[PDB]
RNA sequence: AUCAGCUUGUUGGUGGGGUGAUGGCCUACCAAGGCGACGACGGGUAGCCGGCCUGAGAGGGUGACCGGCCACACUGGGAC
RNA sequence: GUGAGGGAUGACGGCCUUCGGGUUGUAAACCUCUUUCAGCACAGACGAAGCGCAAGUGACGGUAUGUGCAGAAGAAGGACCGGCCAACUACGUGCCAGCAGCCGCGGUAAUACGUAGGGUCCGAGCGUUGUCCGGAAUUACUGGGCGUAAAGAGCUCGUAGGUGGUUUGUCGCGUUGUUCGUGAAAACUCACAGCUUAACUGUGGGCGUGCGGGCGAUACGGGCAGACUAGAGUACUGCAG
RNA sequence: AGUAACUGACGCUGAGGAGCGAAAGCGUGGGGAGCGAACAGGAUUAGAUACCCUGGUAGUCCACGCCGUAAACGGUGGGUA
RNA sequence: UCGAAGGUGGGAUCGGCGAUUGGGACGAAGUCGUAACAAGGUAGCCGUACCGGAAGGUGCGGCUGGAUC
RNA sequence: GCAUUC
């Protein structure tokens, strides 16, 4: 069955990015919405919106490709996963591409990036790497 | 893969079965 | 394998075949030799290889190679055996130290002397 | 122990001036022996190795002691090649050579070892003694009029004195204002190859 | 001045009714030590002609390595033809910590400080290809900033900005000394 | 597990005994429990640790000296 | 520490050779220069704000360490040199005698055998054997695989276990922050000091990843109480085999 | 498949375990035309314990059990996007 | 009463030797065939059964990892 | 149709 909605979200993004699709439609979740918000603020996606479907909301993510069709997302990795969940202290926060990518960390303060989390001195669950 | 691999196993198995044939009665008498 | 499988069973390292078992964990073992005899090497090489059958203090019978060009040893000679694989020979795993116990150093050595138990010339 | 065999043959093998005043090197810049002319197959290991040999046979340091120098340099917070060079530069026999009171690093070693120098007022005959900031090195009374040291007084000029050293008196008094930085050090060697040799 | 490394000479052979027809192949790496490197594979009936053809193919395949200072930008893992090479940036002084084939690529690229490990096939040809694949995965912080739409201070680590600054200063120093 | 069942003072209760002290620690009676594939019960090996060696690290190996605990003192049992 | 400086178109002798010579080799001889460590003399401890206060008392010890004297004087070996892997030639035996970690070298022209000259790496050590880690991502948590290379159970059902769609509230067990207690000394590591330097030793930080107590956060996992229909199942109407 | 009438995460997988599992084979009782291990002859060949020919018994078939293997192969575990 | 050592008894379990006997590996230039690799001269192989100095042959079912058309 | 071996 469906076992990891966040991994499904990341792979839908990855597969559409490979196919140069302009849009991705997903089943909406509040956790997926917050991740998409982070991707927008960090510049990896262009925009997102919430639409309605027959039975629930849908997330529409619009992908960002620069001039000469160059992908804005180089890689997308699910880090914490069901069962093998990964937690990091604020002093052991992971670096992605030596600091040029973003790690998405779920914190009691909300979802944050490794940069924000380290400034605020909070740890949490390492959801995904984006670069 | 190559039939050579099967042929090696074939021989070993065949010789074992033939050994079991020849010793069948001996194995009964010595197992009692 | 999945993490659950690893948690349940785990990883099992390859077991190490104990080498040179007849030394019983010693660097060398003293021994008395029952036979001295030459032996043929494996097919591509051809020689008469000087070998002794040595009863060790470990209570194991062993075949040992005799390095050097010339030896004094015969039955009931007391030798010191060290590890040493001679590729050519089929079952031979130990070498006799030249210059120790009854074994004399090989005569007229001038190079690699320390490996053949020959004193420096004065 | 020390290496006391011929000195030219070492510079000849390594293809560089170690003493730097050696006529027999310039006459025969090829390696020594019967086959010293013959073509040598290139290898990265031989290059790395020979840079290490140039370092240790310039300063006269045995391999055991030199390897301890490497570990300290690598442990130190700077970049390993700079730290290694300035550690060997801190050696008292080297400081004496850089000051000019000696002709060769071999001569510098013998002088220091035989007990002719004092550091901060205490006799030191350890050639490997590493000078530190604000060390003062002096000559004992007996050795001041000593015939080769007299030569050393009026033979000033053979080489230049580096900025971290300073000879201030006719007593031949040496002051060390600091440890030399890589720029200050002037040695015919590529230190990066030795760091790589010990990373093998 | 071009630095040229011959990584491997391989004696190959075709078979014909008359016997074995031997040939030579040379893997050659050419670079300027300024972040240009090319790999050329040349094959001929004799070793010097094979090397010469390799040099020419390498110059045809020059590409540019993103270098922050004397080091690569960020860790990368390049895989090609069963060859796997991991590249990791190192602090100044570390030196080229690399295996034989990867050393030739990186020395001719002018990388001075790097950690490189080969983790797949040991075949020199494919290790070189994997090393090139890794170097092509390197990204410049300028290009990350642009592709993301963010400023440079927002996408890069402060310490990498610092090492950038000092390296630019040494480039300016060489330009001052060279134009004086 | 090429070791699957083990346990009857054994698991629990009350009245006594015992100890510096709690407690089947012991004892009489009463209840029929207790432990086991989160490997009970067996078999093999071994003093444990701060540490040490190696290793990029994770890990692997190891426990000489020095320092801390434990155990024993010809073998087995016992108390004063 | 067994010496340092100088020292020629470069001796003798040894070993190669295209008989030109070339190597050893600035090496040596010789010519001056300093005696560290050993040697022979003469001084001579600290450890003891101690102990006994009766006034004597250091096992180490006439040791360590100072000051004089004589003279390069007494002081270098071991392994390796086919590729890895730094370092090559001649002669002697010709599948023999032997070498070898692996691949492999010996069949009367061997850079692999033995010796010699030369060379290289180490040095009061150098090699060998044994043992453990590394290289070995070759048990792979970091960090591997299963069409044909070793590897999908012959196929299902299902027990323990593992895992869990969307959403509201709540707990604060996992997770995370902070503070306190503890994590002996030594070791390790950073700094600084003391032994002539170093090894070594001492002092002050860090380390001691952990665990326990208090207090803070509630995104995510989980527990608890609800809601929802996209997964799952049922009903009804058709249909193919 | 259509319709969403109904339940409201009831799902997925599954160590052990249980069931099913070609052909050959085995047990008891039937049946036995054709085919056909073994077994005979004939031929071929140096030999021919084979291939080819003529025959031919178990078996192949049925009833009820057992056995639990196959290149049981898509040499490809199951679920989901 | 408990109780070391000792005695008796029937078993567990771990090994050593053992007339004789089974296969396995390796060894030089031995004997007998020629089973496999080409359609290997009867395509090979898998399970099973019976048979034969030996490789192996044959039946039944299966596979292509089988040539020619 | 038959055609073993090196
Ligand atoms: Mg020493
Ligand atoms: Mg490999
Ligand atoms: Mg009571
Ligand atoms: Mg014990
Ligand atoms: Mg490792
Ligand atoms: Mg070499
Ligand atoms: Mg490992
Ligand atoms: Mg190993
Ligand atoms: Mg593998
Ligand atoms: Mg798979
Ligand atoms: Mg296979
Ligand atoms: Mg299957
Ligand atoms: Mg369940
Ligand atoms: Mg959930
Ligand atoms: Mg659950
Ligand atoms: Mg401590
Ligand atoms: Mg199931
Ligand atoms: Mg199962
Ligand atoms: Mg049947
Ligand atoms: Mg039958
Ligand atoms: Mg029947
Ligand atoms: Mg019947
Ligand atoms: Mg017939
Ligand atoms: Mg059945
Ligand atoms: Mg099977
Ligand atoms: Mg089938
Ligand atoms: Mg299968
Ligand atoms: Mg699948
Ligand atoms: Mg017997
Ligand atoms: Mg045939
Ligand atoms: Mg056939
Ligand atoms: Mg035939
Ligand atoms: Mg076939
Ligand atoms: Mg037949
Ligand atoms: Mg058939
Ligand atoms: Mg024959």
UniProtKB/TrEMBL annotation, chain B:
Listed InterPro entries: Ribosomal_mS38_C
Pfam families attached to this UniProt entry: COX24_C (PF08213)
Entry superkingdom: Bacteria
UniProt domain Ribosomal protein mS38 C-terminal: residue ranges: 1-32
SMART domains: DUF1713 (SM01155)
TM regions (residue ranges): none
Region (Disordered): 1-32
Protein name in the entry: Conserved domain protein
């Amino acid at each position: 069955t469906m076992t990891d909605p966040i991994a499904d979200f990341l792979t839908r993004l990855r597969n559409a990015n490979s196919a140069y699709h302009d849009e991705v439609t997903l089943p909406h979740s509040k956790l997926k919405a917050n991740i998409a918000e982070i991707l927008k603020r960090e510049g990896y996606i262009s925009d997102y919106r919430t639409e309605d479907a027959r039975v629930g909301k849908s997330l529409v993510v619009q992908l960002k490709y620069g001039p000469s069709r160059e992908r804005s997302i180089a890689g997308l990795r699910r880090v914490s996963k069901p069962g093998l969940r990964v937690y990091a202290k604020s002093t052991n926060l992971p670096r992605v591409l030596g600091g040029l990518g973003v790690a998405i960390i779920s914190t009691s303060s909300g979802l944050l990036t490794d940069r924000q989390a380290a400034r605020q001195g909070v740890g949490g669950e390492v959801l995904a790497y984006v670069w | 893969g190559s039939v050579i691999k099967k042929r090696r196993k074939r021989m070993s198995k065949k010789k074992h079965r033939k050994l079991l044939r020849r010793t069948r009665v001996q194995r009964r008498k010595l197992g009692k | 394998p999945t993490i659950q499988q690893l948690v349940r069973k785990g990883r099992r390292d390859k077991i190490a075949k104990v080498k040179t078992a007849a030394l019983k964990g010693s660097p060398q073992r003293r021994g008395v030799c029952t036979r001295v005899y030459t032996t043929t090497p494996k097919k591509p090489n051809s020689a008469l290889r000087k070998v002794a059958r040595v009863k060790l203090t470990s209570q194991v019978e062993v075949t040992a190679y005799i390095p050097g060009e010339g030896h004094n040893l015969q039955e009931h000679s007391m030798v010191l055996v060290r590890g040493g694989r001679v590729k050519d020979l089929p079952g031979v795993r130990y070498k006799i130290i030249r210059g120790s116990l009854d074994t004399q150093g090989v005569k007229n050595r001038k190079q690699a002397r320390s490996r053949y138990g020959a004193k420096k010339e004065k | 122990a020390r290496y006391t065999g011929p000195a030219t043959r070492k510079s000849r093998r390594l293809g560089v001036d170690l003493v730097g005043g050696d006529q027999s090197f310039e006459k025969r810049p090829y390696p020594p022996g019967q086959h010293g002319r013959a073509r040598i197959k290139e290898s990265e290991y031989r290059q790395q190795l020979q840079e290490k040999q140039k370092a240790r046979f310039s300063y006269g340091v045995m391999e055991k002691q030199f390897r301890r120098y490497y570990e300290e340099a690598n442990r130190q917070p700077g970049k390993t090649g700079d730290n290694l060079l300035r550690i060997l530069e801190s050696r008292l026999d080297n400081v004496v050579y850089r000051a000019g009171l000696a002709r060769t690093r071999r001569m510098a070693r013998q002088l220091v070892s035989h007990g002719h120098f004092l550091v901060n007022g205490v006799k030191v005959d350890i050639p490997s003694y590493r000078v530190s900031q604000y060390d003062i090195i002096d000559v004992k009374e007996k050795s001041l009029n000593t015939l080769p040291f007299q030569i050393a007084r009026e033979t000033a000029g053979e080489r230049p004195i580096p900025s971290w050293l300073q000879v201030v008196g006719e007593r031949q008094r040496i002051l060390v204002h600091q440890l030399p930085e890589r720029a200050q050090i002037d040695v015919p060697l590529t230190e990066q190859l030795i760091v790589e040799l010990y990373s093998k | 001045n071009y630095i040229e490394r011959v990584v491997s000479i391989n004696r190959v052979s075709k078979v014909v009714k008359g016997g074995r027809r031997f040939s030579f192949t040379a893997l050659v790496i050419v670079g300027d030590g300024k972040g240009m490197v090319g790999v050329g594979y040349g094959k001929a009936k004799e070793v010097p002609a094979a090397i010469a053809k390799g040099v020419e193919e390498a110059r045809k395949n020059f590409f540019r390595v993103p270098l922050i200072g004397s080091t690569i930008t960020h860790p990368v893992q390049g895989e090609a033809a069963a060859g796997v090479v991991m590249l990791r940036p190192a602090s100044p002084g570390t030196g080229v910590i690399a295996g034989g084939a990867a050393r030739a690529v990186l020395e001719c690229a002018g990388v001075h400080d790097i950690l490189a490990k080969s983790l797949g096939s040991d075949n020199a040809i494919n290790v070189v290809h994997a090393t090139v694949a890794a170097l092509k995965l390197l990204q410049r912080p300028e290009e990350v900033a642009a592709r993301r739409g963010l400023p440079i201070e927002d996408v890069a680590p402060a310490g990498m900005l610092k090492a950038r600054r000092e390296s630019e200063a040494l480039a300016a120093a060489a330009a001052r000394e060279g134009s004086a």
